[model samples]
Target: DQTAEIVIHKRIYRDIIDPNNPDKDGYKLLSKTSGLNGANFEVYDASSLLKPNMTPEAIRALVDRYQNMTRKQALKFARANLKLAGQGNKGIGLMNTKNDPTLGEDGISRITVSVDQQAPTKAYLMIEVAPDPSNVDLERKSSPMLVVFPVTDPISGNPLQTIHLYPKNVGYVRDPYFFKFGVHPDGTSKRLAGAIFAIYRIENGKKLYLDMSPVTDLRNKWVSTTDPLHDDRVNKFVSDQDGLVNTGERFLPAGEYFFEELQGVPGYEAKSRAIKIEIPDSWEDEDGNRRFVLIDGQPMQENFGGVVTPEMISSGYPRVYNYADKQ
Candidate 1:
């Protein structure tokens, strides 16, 4: 049998993880693995040695909580797949994601896939793997083969609209952070990262979670990193060093929804607001399957303008400066 030692890339915010300290819970990456379109790609798929040690349910847990609302929950979700690690507990904490170089250094997270020779024929990973749990033949949206793209909004003249956020009622010193820990800023806060957020629909003064219909992601099944599905109190989305929110390429549908702020940065107030944005219609292919976002007939990655920090691509807690704690 042939053997190959692979170093696949996975991404996470290092500043948030406390590998050096046990006192603090480290930040998790709520990310997972998948193919171009429900296609299953793995490091083993490329390697000569890969042992099968994962289940569909075990696969389910990874895409949901690689990085979760809290370190506790994140760790718990991670533990659920321990028995599935190919080499003893080697798969614990490892992920199965490929790197998108377009994400740039600060644009996306990068992780390592190390070698653990627990078994001569096995490649032990820190994270678990899931390959076509249900249907290995799953297609893009509705059919086996299809094409999807974004249509420009007539009024906005932009392919898509984005939500920019800053904490309400606060004084944010512009670019108020230093590269070194010893060099402190006048304000205790530089930018608030890792605040929990969710997109919701409102009806008659009540809020309803948005529909996560027609499964997205390569798993052919998708759930929102938006909730604990129960505990709304401390649930949060991870943010980057920058105070910007990037929802990736998923265009928001036209509707009135709450940009619900689930939690706020420590020593600051947690608040949310309702926002109404117009989403244009998505283009469907000849097969009638809904298409993922493609701008001007090209892949989204081919298009630049991705921010340097992970915070810019997702909408979590507003990454802003805080002045509440004056020690």
Candidate 2:
């Protein structure tokens, strides 16, 4: 074990919600099961930074600072600010550690770090330099991961000489919402506010009610009749004064869900069917930008949905409408 070299096997995935198995959470694979391709990675030996007396806060700051910088820039910054291990003599202390073949179509890359007796244990910062072009619309790239060699598997409790890493390239859309309104008695339109709405996660052709509480940290979190948060009143999401159905969440996880207008604007009749919305199962727009696909087609424009809010007019949220005269 003393003379063993550490082997790192990296598997990159284009993480998306599983459409077939809507009940399962996280990056459940679809038909494109093979890992993603066309990613470049760089590894820097960061053992020296993991000093015994270093404070946790300072170490976290260093990690956060380097996460935003590219590999070359991170190396440049690390060279000046921190002391690095002197092994390779090319220029920086680190060498070209990526394998000869590089990342292939299979989306697997290997990195080997030789741990000599002089430095029996080591830590390395693995950074993704370039990501696959298809994910152009994704919010951000995978942050660098700090790994230490000669670790024991927490689950198996066995020493792990070879470490497999599955890095996820995930994204979220901001405030995916819709507009609400009722048709006027004459010819004009009315942007109706104070209409209560709720979202239900549709799975297995069944509607599962969801808890939209603490909207900041919401997922496809389900609620049952037994759960207190499942009360009809608690789940009611109101349309803003602008008539935009702001669900209070900054974003919603990629999945299949529907928005149903539970209580209509004072004089309007609520729709019977929920508006089916899909966050997409890994697809590209005409321009190849990954985007949310609301299944019920485009929302009604300002001309049909009455006077639209600034956000409703520009944000492109799906629209739902009601008529005062209709039963």
Candidate 3:
């Protein structure tokens, strides 16, 4: 039996909501919507009219011939034989309801050639449509949307991998969980064992809900400090080995001490005395994967944090923003 769990990153929470209205309890933010919709379509025309009894090679030759033909010429030939059959929207004499007339009375068509003898013995065409007026909304509830990355299987150790995602259309702003070169965690580190990217939006009706998580990326971008003093203390806890004694030096009562007393401290305090540490060039979580952190190219650490409630997740749009409420 195999079981899988999704690890969500923290960065998502810091990017999508107004920091000033952290609680969002009494805030009414305006919503924006776009009128234009983007669509992409592909059509394939593979039928036997020239040679009703066609073989694989014969079909290939026909496809080759058609491949070099101009689009206008192809359309002309297809329009000439509406009854013989092809694939696309059908309309009246060149105006079929099946086809979008605006595109062309006779829709665009093409042929695909394959060398494998077993690959589809019959010649067939294909048509794909992404129509306008497609209902698309930016507002959504925030929730855990699964994302997959190639990693060495913990059990089999095989390289090829596929990630199965549940609940499609979920967008995320995940943290770069791997290392600079994209390595995954193995048996050795104390950090979290998997890759986690922050997710900020899940499509909803017309408004996006907000929440916070660790997957959010903050490197290079400015984050306002929630509590600079407290944050400084937290930084020290992680950076100085939790206040273990510095084996290289000793505290002594004498006329003078080597190096400045202030400079001898560990962690952030020591880091503060030296040149400020800019965003790291690279970082890795508890695992060994390579990743990057972007702070919107700003310097301050912003305070943003919250949880994804079941109600909000079910509501649809999922968005996260910086936490600015002092609470």
Candidate 4:
């Protein structure tokens, strides 16, 4: 009498941003908590052939878990837990890429926010999500953050320096990573760190994937909380290096673009595809909330419905995944 359907999708080189054409930027299976989405997932009953009992507080706790079960959890229901959730849909997760990509103008969604640096610095690349350099103080225009790692040379290009150049101070921005292993096994060519990627733009009726490169270093020091940090403090922009480098401080204008691996990876047939990334116009909701940049597919960062920290504290998270995994 009890039956249900469980849909499991592999978060690989799939669509997650383009409205007309979205694709995955060379990444992983599950993100931090899941959507990279990374690792594996499973679910089971807490009280089955084991304890045939339930506590009053246990029941409440159980319900709390599922409250925002779909929300991305940092410690607890955490890890690619859910998708298309208004509560935490805005943060870094499945929204990183999706088939139907979109965005809004709500104030709550931090379109120009930084990606979480909690993940491993392996071959990676992401849309340039930082302050609009065209701004006054490099202030956050509430754009969107796009970051990827371990794509190749950890710090191939000098993405870490692009932001510190301006007085606006967009320090929270994330930089690209690389492993400076020097010469390769052949003792020739400076190790192939990552791949070459281009952001396709549309002109007339054709989609143009422009060859993207690391912005030349425009800094005399590191842009950190130390305020105009010393040159020794951080790695300045290294203008030339790997192709799939992070756009440290720069932010792309509101446009339609897709990502593709020109040629990267060490061994095996380096398989990667293009993913759509849209930087939409900013807008404020009726509640006066700014919209976040489009991710995977939906907009809005941590949904208040039950995602964020404060929400889980009192409101609690979900209880089951599909009715199972929750915080």
Relative to the unseen true structure, what is the Cα RMSD of model 3?
22.2
**lDDT per residue (tens digit) for residues 225-247 in model 2:** 44323475236667876677754
lDDT of the candidates, in the order given: 0.29, 0.51, 0.24, 0.26
Q: For candidate 3, write residues 218-256 as lDDT tens digits.
A: 111122334333332211111122221111111111011
Sorted by TM-score (best first), the order is 2, 1, 4, 3
- The residue ranges of model 2 lying beyond 4 angstroms of the native Cα positions read 1-174, 213-218, 226-234, 286-292, 299-318
Please state the error at residue 96 of candidate 4 in Å: 43
TM-score of each: 0.26, 0.45, 0.23, 0.23
Pick by TM-score: which candidate is best? 2
Residue-wise C-alpha lDDT for candidate 1, range 1-327, written one tens digit per residue: 322222222222111221212122332221232212212111111112222554434433432333223433433443443332221112423333333457322111222223322322322222223422443322111001000011133588643222111100111000101110111244333555555454455566655553434323322122243353354432223334554433432223322334454555455432352222222233346788634332112222211222224432343222233345445
Clashes of each: 22, 1, 64, 85
Q: Which candidate, 1 or 4, has the higher lDDT?
A: 1
Model 4 spans > 4 angstroms off: 1-193, 209-245, 267-272, 298-327
Tens-digit lDDT string for candidate 4 (1-327): 111111122221201121111133322111211111121222222222112244435444543444323322311322233122111223532222112223211111111212212222211111113222232312221111112211122356423311100001121111112212133344443333444443445567664433233221211121222311132333222212332233333334444554433433444111344444554433345777755544224342322111233432232211110101111
